Design an enzyme around this catalytic site. Structure first.
Site, PDB file in Angstrom:
ATOM      1  N   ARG A 221      45.711  -4.746  -1.527  1.00  0.00           N
ATOM      2  CA  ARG A 221      44.804  -4.419  -0.463  1.00  0.00           C
ATOM      3  C   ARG A 221      43.704  -4.147  -1.271  1.00  0.00           C
ATOM      4  O   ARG A 221      43.568  -3.311  -1.659  1.00  0.00           O
ATOM      5  CB  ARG A 221      46.042  -2.839   0.027  1.00  0.00           C
ATOM      6  N   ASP A 223      40.220  -3.045  -0.395  1.00  0.00           N
ATOM      7  CA  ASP A 223      39.092  -1.736   0.506  1.00  0.00           C
ATOM      8  C   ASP A 223      38.463  -1.954   0.783  1.00  0.00           C
ATOM      9  O   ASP A 223      37.456  -2.479   0.591  1.00  0.00           O
ATOM     10  CB  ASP A 223      39.416  -0.387  -0.389  1.00  0.00           C
ATOM     11  N   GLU A 251      40.992  -2.935   4.499  1.00  0.00           N
ATOM     12  CA  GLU A 251      41.361  -2.059   5.846  1.00  0.00           C
ATOM     13  C   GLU A 251      39.910  -1.869   6.407  1.00  0.00           C
ATOM     14  O   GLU A 251      38.956  -1.709   6.057  1.00  0.00           O
ATOM     15  CB  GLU A 251      41.226  -0.407   4.535  1.00  0.00           C
ATOM     16  N   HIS A 321      46.230   7.040   3.714  1.00  0.00           N
ATOM     17  CA  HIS A 321      45.661   8.262   3.401  1.00  0.00           C
ATOM     18  C   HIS A 321      44.279   8.701   4.054  1.00  0.00           C
ATOM     19  O   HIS A 321      43.816  10.288   3.636  1.00  0.00           O
ATOM     20  CB  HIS A 321      45.317   7.261   1.768  1.00  0.00           C
ATOM     21  N   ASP A 322      43.748   8.000   5.340  1.00  0.00           N
ATOM     22  CA  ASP A 322      42.959   8.562   5.572  1.00  0.00           C
ATOM     23  C   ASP A 322      43.109   8.899   7.146  1.00  0.00           C
ATOM     24  O   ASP A 322      42.223   9.179   8.375  1.00  0.00           O
ATOM     25  CB  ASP A 322      41.212   7.251   6.235  1.00  0.00           C
ATOM     26  N   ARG A 369      47.492  14.463   1.134  1.00  0.00           N
ATOM     27  CA  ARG A 369      47.619  13.686  -0.641  1.00  0.00           C
ATOM     28  C   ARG A 369      47.958  14.401  -1.667  1.00  0.00           C
ATOM     29  O   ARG A 369      48.170  14.856  -2.868  1.00  0.00           O
ATOM     30  CB  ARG A 369      45.926  13.289  -1.005  1.00  0.00           C
TER      31      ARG A 369
END
Ligand code: CA
Ligand code: CA
Length: 678
Positions: A221, A223, A251, A321-322, A369
């Site tokens: 994945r 970034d 992403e 996560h965002d 998180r």
């Protein structure tokens, strides 16, 4: 091996991905936790390290928490050594608990574990048929100031952000985010930007990923893909695909189901997929926020299926996560449960952010998180995933299936997933208080009595077909039922192909049904690929060697027993190995709204096209300013190219005059070629 098998590193469509912040899951080994301020037992200060490690993940695998949940792949934090220091943003001590501030891409982060720990974790996951996907952030190092954003090549030092003589980084300040070029060529806040046109960096990163794939990683994945040049990324991908092809997604943030040109672009030209923010937004606007109805959701499905060349490779999700957790005080369980079900039975590769099965809340960074609270297998959401996750493996209509709106209204949606003779129908009633009288529902389910796969855990009901015509029924308030139908396919019918871009010589995987066990022939365009070129061939999976035909966009066809399968389109065949070359043209002034593109004598520049295949529009502000444009392109290595720029605006194309410019590319790495506009 079946398409299903953990082995299948080129396709994730049949899996369920469990996104997990390594540090926030399980401290299965205390003997490697940070010391002092940079650590916090309680894990109350979410900004500090909490102790999570690779042994923790191992333990959960071993006690079947994951095997019971149904997840078939783990997506861990970046495994590389991160800065050891601590940064004090606005009085608050911040640590690199996240994994995102790398300092040595060739060494494992001691806090997560050792190399042998990692190996230990790659072996234990495969044993239970779980795949491992990893985060790779080649965009930058760590925030300048922590450690002068230094990068070590397996111990040895490469260079720091300051007194960077050889230019391994970009020093154009930080991106204000006003354009794609400003984001690519300027730093992310304080994050030290690497300069990829620099050759040692280009090669450091090809060499780095190589190491990880070698150890057995199943997917990467990547970034910040919107912050790196496409040209470079693609070239990097060709390096990966030429070594050990693995499912790679990136992403590229979006804030709606709304289509995006650059997004859709990258998704079809880089050689890697994206995280589906367009989907996420619709899934959240309907199920969570109550700001759109089933229409919005359906409208997204048709549009995405229409924009992305291979919609089945995008990665769906209800949160991550965002963003704020799906779950909050106003959002209720059934709604979470509905979003999960919707996603698990949907098109693409789905991922559940850790602790969703435990209804975890946390709005914004870093509260979203939080530490994994329970390992309870009792929650209803835990149930829903175990019920449904397994379907992606057993029913190929969920895996590779198309989607058809079969009955919709503001609160109710009933859609169809069908692949060959297999089906799955899914009814959803987001109205928590009023049920719906469904009349005249039509599906492709053969005549019979169907039991809601979910055993009613989400107020699902049974149905009855009459050659597709379902009998009148009531869908309870906040209900969601799933009724499928499966059978053996007897006709070669292609369901996936991975990777979808490559140079002749590479190996691609074709997944599907009805291929038989007798090596037929593959069709790369009109070119039969037979015998020894077909390295492997069984009913669900054929490994075939990319034939050596002219670079370009082909369609793949499997002919089993004379019967031709369906065609998988847009399969990209490269000229050969790539290198990232930067093209700079001077005095190339334009008119208001007129732009500058590029094209030349190789499929990678678009074989003299002025259309959707030409490189551009070249940049004109960060690395080079107008009237000088520039653009980084992936291009066949070693070969001599002919190319020419062109302005394009209304419809009218104006080519540079005179002869074609020429450049013989480097056998490896990167290069720059400057030219004057003719
Ligand atoms: Ca630990
Ligand atoms: Ca960058």
């Amino acid at each position: 091996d079946p398409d299903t098998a953990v082995t299948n590193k080129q396709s994730f469509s049949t899996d369920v991905i469990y996104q997990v912040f390594t540090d926030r899951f399980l401290d299965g080994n205390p003997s490697n936790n940070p010391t002092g301020a940079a650590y916090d037992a309680t894990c109350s200060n979410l900004k500090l390290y909490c102790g999570g490690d690779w042994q923790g993940l191992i333990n959960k695998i071993n006690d079947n928490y994951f095997s019971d949940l149904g997840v078939t792949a783990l997506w861990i934090s970046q495994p590389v050594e991160n800065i050891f220091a601590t940064i004090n943003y606005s009085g608050v001590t911040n640590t690199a608990y996240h994994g995102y501030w790398a300092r040595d891409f060739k060494k494992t982060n001691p806090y997560f574990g050792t190399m042998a720990d990692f190996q230990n974790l790659i072996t234990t996951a495969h044993a239970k048929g779980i795949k491992i996907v990893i985060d790779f952030a080649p965009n930058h190092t760590s925030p300048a100031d922590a450690e002068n954003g230094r990068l070590y090549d397996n111990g040895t030092l490469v260079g720091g952000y300051t007194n960077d003589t050889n230019g391994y980084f970009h020093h154009n300040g930080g991106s204000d985010f006003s354009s794609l070029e400003n984001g690519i060529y300027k730093n992310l806040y304080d994050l030290a930007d690497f300069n990829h046109n620099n050759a040692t960096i280009d090669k450091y990163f090809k060499d780095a990923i190589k190491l990880w794939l070698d150890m057995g990683v199943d997917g990467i994945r990547v970034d910040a893909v919107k912050h790196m040049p496409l040209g470079w990324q693609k070239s990097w991908m060709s390096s990966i695909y030429a070594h050990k092809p693995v499912f790679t997604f990136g992403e590229w943030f979006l804030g709606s189901a709304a289509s995006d040109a650059d997004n859709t672009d990258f998704a079809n030209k880089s050689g890697m997929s994206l995280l589906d923010f367009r989907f996420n937004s619709a899934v959240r606007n309907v199920f969570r926020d109550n700001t759109s109805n089933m229409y919005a959701l359906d409208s997204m499905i048709n549009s995405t299926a229409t924009d992305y060349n291979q919609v089945n490779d995008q990665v769906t999700f209800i949160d991550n996560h965002d963003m704020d957790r799906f779950k909050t005080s106003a959002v209720n369980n059934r709604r979470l449960e509905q979003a999960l079900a919707f996603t698990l039975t949907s098109r693409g590769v789905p991922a559940i952010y850790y602790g969703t099965e435990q209804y975890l809340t946390g709005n914004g960074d870093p509260d979203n998180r939080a530490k994994m609270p329970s390992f309870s297998k009792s929650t209803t959401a835990f149930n829903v995933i175990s019920k449904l996750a397994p379907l992606r493996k057993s029913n190929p209509a969920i895996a590779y299936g198309s989607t058809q709106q079969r009955w919709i209204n503001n609160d109710v949606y009933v859609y169809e997933r069908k692949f060959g003779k297999s089906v799955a129908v899914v009814a959803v009633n987001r109205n928590l208080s009023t049920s719906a009288s469904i009349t005249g529902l039509s599906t492709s389910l053969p005549t019979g009595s169907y039991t809601d796969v979910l055993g009613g855990v989400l107020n699902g009901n049974n149905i009855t077909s009459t050659n597709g015509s379902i009998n009148n029924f009531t869908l309870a308030a906040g209900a969601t039922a799933v009724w499928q139908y499966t059978t053996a396919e007897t006709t070669p019918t292609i369901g996936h192909v991975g990777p979808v871009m490559g140079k002749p010589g590479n190996v691609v995987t074709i997944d599907g049904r009805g291929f038989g066990s007798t090596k037929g022939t593959v069709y790369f365009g009109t070119t039969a690929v037979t015998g020894a070129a077909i390295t492997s061939w069984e009913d669900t999976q054929i490994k075939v060697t990319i034939p050596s035909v002219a670079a370009g966009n082909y369609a793949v066809k499997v002919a089993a027993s004379g019967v031709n399968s369906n065609a998988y389109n847009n399969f990209t065949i490269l000229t050969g190995d790539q290198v990232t070359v930067r093209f700079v043209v001077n005095n190339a002034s334009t008119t208001l709204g007129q732009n500058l593109y590029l094209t030349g004598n190789v499929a990678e520049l678009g074989n003299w096209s002025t259309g959707s295949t030409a490189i551009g529009p070249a940049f004109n502000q960060v690395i080079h300013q107008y009237p000088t444009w520039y653009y980084d392109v992936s291009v066949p290595a070693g070969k001599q190219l002919e190319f020419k720029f062109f302005k394009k605006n209304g419809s009218t194309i104006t080519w540079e005059s005179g002869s074609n410019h020429t450049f013989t590319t480097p056998a490896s790495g990167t290069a720059t070629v400057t030219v004057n506009w003719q």
